[PDB]
């Protein structure tokens, strides 16, 4: 009976870790875009449209 709970909670932890990794990848892409926009628009004048 304990093995089923252990397996379920381990699978839940693995799913949470996978979701957090995907969300961290999205946040990394957003942060790279934000750093590029900072270095371009703030520390200079950009000629890129939109």
């Amino acid at each position: 009976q304990i093995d089923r709970l252990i397996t379920g909670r381990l699978q839940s932890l693995q799913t949470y870790v996978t979701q957090q990794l995907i969300r961290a990848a999205e946040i990394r892409a957003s942060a790279n875009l934000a750093a590029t926009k900072m270095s371009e628009c703030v520390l200079g004048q950009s000629k890129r449209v939109d």
Partner: protein, 49 residues
């Protein structure tokens, strides 16, 4: 088309709702990307004859 299967699945947790939310987010972000790519100007122009 089963009843006992659903009764046994309801004891696992919120996996069903989690997968549903993930698929809904995917479906929403697809349209978000489609609008961000094409719908860039809020004015439909037409070529002269």
């Amino acid at each position: 088309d089963s009843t006992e299967c659903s009764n046994l699945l309801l004891q696992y947790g919120s996996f069903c709702t989690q997968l549903n939310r993930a698929l809904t987010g995917i479906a929403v972000e697809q349209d978000k990307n489609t609008q961000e790519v094409f719908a860039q100007v809020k004015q439909i122009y037409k070529t002269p004859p």
